[PDB]
Amino acid sequence: MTSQIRQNYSTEVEAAVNRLVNLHLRASYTYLSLGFFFDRDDVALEGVGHFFRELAEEKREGAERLLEFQNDRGGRALFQDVQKPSQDEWGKTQEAMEAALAMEKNLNQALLDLHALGSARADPHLCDFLESHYLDKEVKLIKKMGNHLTNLRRVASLGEYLFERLTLKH
Amino acid sequence: TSQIRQNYSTEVEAAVNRLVNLHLRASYTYLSLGFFFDRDDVALEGVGHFFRELAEEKREGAERLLEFQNDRGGRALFQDVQKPSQDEWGKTQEAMEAALAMEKNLNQALLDLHALGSARADPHLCDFLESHYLDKEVKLIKKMGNHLTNLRRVASLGEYLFERLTLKH
Amino acid sequence: MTSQIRQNYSTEVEAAVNRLVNLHLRASYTYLSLGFFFDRDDVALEGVGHFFRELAEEKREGAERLLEFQNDRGGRALFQDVQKPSQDEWGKTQEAMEAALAMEKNLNQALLDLHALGSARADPHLCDFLESHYLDKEVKLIKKMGNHLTNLRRVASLGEYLFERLTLKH
Amino acid sequence: TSQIRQNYSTEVEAAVNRLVNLHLRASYTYLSLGFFFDRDDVALEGVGHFFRELAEEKREGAERLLEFQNDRGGRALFQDVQKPSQDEWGKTQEAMEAALAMEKNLNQALLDLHALGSARADPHLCDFLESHYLDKEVKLIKKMGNHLTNLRRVASLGEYLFERLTLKH
């Protein structure tokens, strides 16, 4: 059938929002894997673990907010398989932070493609939603990850422990 | 002409005037609805309060659009506020369908004004409409869709129960 | 690789905890799908939606607690694909509650299988953890779902709305 | 022969006595460790406080096991508490490895007592051990493993930094 409330909503935009919800769920899954990898007994870096566990929660809230938006606009959420994380062990915190930065840059590129699509179909509500809820948060998180990576390259064992102790915990 | 007018078009100004007129007429229709649902032969005060609040919201929208028109250097031109389309609105389901259609038309007018402002390169107007008008409209349309679904679900007795358990509290 | 803290922990039990984490994640995914299906404009039962959204949170906390346990015991978490929910649309709230009850009973059966496995391999900490954190919660949730199903069969349109209004909180 | 003894075995009673002795010996060793780490030529007061707290935890464990033995109708038999296995414990990494080995031995003894009580069908003893001894022991072993990983990571200067930023916090 057709929704009674659906207005100025495209099927392409709806599929793109569904794919974005899947991407956000996959990112939350990867961050859960990272956070639980970093509290292992042979890693023992609980600050990095808390960082990634908070990022997993943030991505989960993002996916749930995108689903609420999809429901508000008259679209039907179609859930897909949440692909497992790309790695089982993430090595040092620098490699893990580089992987997280690449993943958020890909998520941001997807957000920007959805914004360009919504601006093409003249969907101002979708673009305003993405701007007020997704774009600035993402650039802030990418800047924070760049700072963390710079400080990790600076302290590069002992420097890794000092970074986890004095930067991530504080 | 005005000393403060900048990046403001005459087409956009006329569109804002027509939009404040649409908002005033929608507030008028919601006032008529809320006072129809308070009659002694209707006696549904929850759905009456619903439309009485919607009339206030539409009036605030029209006044905010007028403040915007004044802030941008435009001249507000007021027109006749056409009387509501109906005197009696029947059951609450028919009235809620009429309100939903009216707000879908209002949201379509808002989107047309946003497209006009984006074509004329008026970023302030589009930002104003996005931050103040679009999301409120989609939220109200979703609420009206939920109300209509629940009204179709309960459909006399179901109407009273909907007004008591959903609209009143 | 011969972790320093692993003691009285089996590889079979570790694989079973991993499968349980995957089952809990799949259940949380299914409950998220349910709670967002019950918030559509053509369903409009936000009480049932809130119920299922709260259950998805509980399943996610269960999976995270099982992962914390796996880390505490010296096991390595292996993440798999989170299979998409079994249905896209769940029909009436009675069919959806029956599906949720079946899923809860299957999750409880998996928990009991893991408890029996841990008792077979003489793993007292695992069985104590499952008893104090998972079994009673499961039987309470199953009893609540049985009560909800009985009341839904009792009120069986108008009865569904009345059940969502007077029984389910928002 | 006691009036309250029920479902209590002589084997289980002897095992609880041996476990109380093991807990007292572990408390003695942790006391020796904590007082070794506040020496003037060690000067690591954080890792000293760590072991001073662990000694108190083992003392509470032994006293709770004695209270349990009294509650079940058994007669506590106290034995000699052997001196700690070392007088000087070297660096904090060697000392933490020794503490981890002692904790794993204590946990293995707890698991043997649990298996014994489950063999004699003593559900109260197993429930007591599960609710009071097993989870605490696995948490302490995980904490010691994390401490050892961080000590191997920072490994002089790294040892001081670990005692300052991890143990004092």
DSSP per position, C88-102: S---SHHHHHHHHHH
For chain A, the chains sharing at least 3 beta-carbon pairs closer than 8 angstroms are B, C, D
Instruction: Write out the two tokens for D52.
Output: 């001073």
The rounded distance, in Å, linking the Cα atoms of C11 and C17 is: 10
- For every residue of D16-57, DSSP letters joined together read HHHHHHHHHHHHHHHHHHHHHTTSTTT--HHHHHHHHHHHHH
The rounded distance, in Å, linking the Cα atoms of A158 and D158 is: 7
Q: Are B161 and C161 a contacting pair at CB < 8 A?
A: yes
D100, D51 Cβ separation under 8 angstroms: no
Question: A44 to chain D: which residues are within 8 Å by CB?
Answer: 145-147, 149-150, 153
Instruction: Write out the two tokens for D14.
Output: 């002897």
The rounded distance, in Å, linking the Cα atoms of D67 and D77 is: 13
The rounded distance, in Å, linking the Cα atoms of C72 and C133 is: 15
SS3 D155: coil
Helix orientation angle between B45-71 and B10-36, rounded to the nearest 10 degrees: 160
Among candidates D92, D5, D80, D79, which has minimal Cα distance to D50?
Answer: D92
Question: What residues form DSSP beta bridges with C82?
Answer: A82
| Locus of tokens 């809860």 | C104
A124, B111 Cβ separation under 8 angstroms: yes
Q: Indicate the DSSP class of residue A83.
A: P
How close does chain C come to D163, measured CA to CA in Å? 21
How close does chain A come to D146, measured CA to CA in Å? 5
Binding site annotation covers B63? Answer: no
Instruction: Write out the two tokens for B129.
Output: 């409409």
Q: Is B164 exposed, middle or buried (0-12, 13-18, 19+ CB in 10 A)?
A: middle
Q: What contacts C4, CB < 8 A, 6 or more positions away?
A: A41, A42, C74, D100, D145, D148
D12, D120 Cβ separation under 8 angstroms: yes
Neighbour tally for B152: CB within 10 Å: 15
Best of B96, B144, B151, B153 to mutate (most C CBs within 10 Å, chain C): B153
C75, C17 Cβ separation under 8 angstroms: yes
| Locus of tokens 């650039």 | A139
Question: Reported resolution in A?
Answer: 3.0
Long-range contacts at B115-121 (CB < 8 A, ≥ 24 apart): B115/A122, B115/A124, B116/B11, B116/B12, B116/B15, B117/B12, B118/A122, B118/A124, B120/B9, B120/B11, B120/B12, B121/B7
Approach to solving: cryo-EM
Alpha carbons within 13 angstroms on the beta-carbon side of residue A156 total: 11
Question: C42 to chain B: which residues are within 8 Å by CB?
Answer: 145, 149
The rounded distance, in Å, linking the Cα atoms of C36 and A71 is: 8
For chain D, the chains sharing at least 3 beta-carbon pairs closer than 8 angstroms are A, C
D147, D92 Cβ separation under 8 angstroms: no
The rounded distance, in Å, linking the Cα atoms of C132 and B139 is: 43
The shares of helix, strand and coil residues in chain B, as percent rounded to the nearest 5, are 75, 0, 25
The rounded distance, in Å, linking the Cα atoms of C97 and C103 is: 10
Q: Are D157 and A158 a contacting pair at CB < 8 A?
A: yes
Do B and D make contact, counting contact as 3+ CB pairs within 8 angstroms? no
Question: D145 to chain C: which residues are within 8 Å by CB?
Answer: 3-5, 74
The rounded distance, in Å, linking the Cα atoms of B148 and B161 is: 14
Q: Are A7 and B142 a contacting pair at CB < 8 A?
A: no
The rounded distance, in Å, linking the Cα atoms of B165 and D90 is: 73
D93, D152 Cβ separation under 8 angstroms: yes
Long-range contacts at A159-164 (CB < 8 A, ≥ 24 apart): A160/A45, A160/A92, A160/A93, A160/A94, A160/D153, A161/A45, A161/D150, A161/D153, A161/D154, A161/D158, A161/D161, A161/D162, A162/D161, A162/D165, A163/A93, A164/A45, A164/A46, A164/A47, A164/A48, A164/A93
Determine phi and psi for A82, rounding to 5 degrees: -90, 100
SS3 A12: helix
Cα A119 to chain centroid, rounded: 22
Quick one: CA dihedral C163, C164, C165, C167, positive or negative? positive
Residue of A nearest to D167 (CA): A165
The rounded distance, in Å, linking the Cα atoms of C66 and C16 is: 11
Among candidates C23, C9, C12, C31, which has minimal Cα distance to C111?
Answer: C23
Q: What contacts C22, CB < 8 A, 6 or more positions away?
A: C79, C80, C82
SS3 C7: coil
SS3 B115: helix
Question: A29 to chain C: which residues are within 8 Å by CB?
Answer: 79, 82
Among candidates A104, A88, A71, A114, which has minimal Cα distance to C33?
Answer: A71
Neighbour tally for D106: CB within 10 Å: 21
The rounded distance, in Å, linking the Cα atoms of C156 and C166 is: 15
Q: Are D131 and C129 a contacting pair at CB < 8 A?
A: no
Instruction: Write out the two tokens for D157.
Output: 């200067």
How close does chain C come to A130, measured CA to CA in Å? 20
Among candidates C111, C16, C132, which has minimal Cα distance to C73?
Answer: C16
Among candidates D158, D159, D110, which has minimal Cα distance to D135?
Answer: D110
Instruction: Write out the two tokens for D36.
Output: 């070794």
Helix orientation angle between A93-120 and A11-37, rounded to the nearest 10 degrees: 170
Determine phi and psi for A10, rounding to 5 degrees: -100, 160
| Locus of tokens 């009387």 | B83
The rounded distance, in Å, linking the Cα atoms of B159 and B3 is: 56
Among candidates C36, C44, C18, which has minimal Cα distance to A33?
Answer: C18
Q: What contacts D40, CB < 8 A, 6 or more positions away?
A: none
Instruction: Write out the two tokens for B50.
Output: 């619903």
Neighbour tally for B31: CB within 10 Å: 18
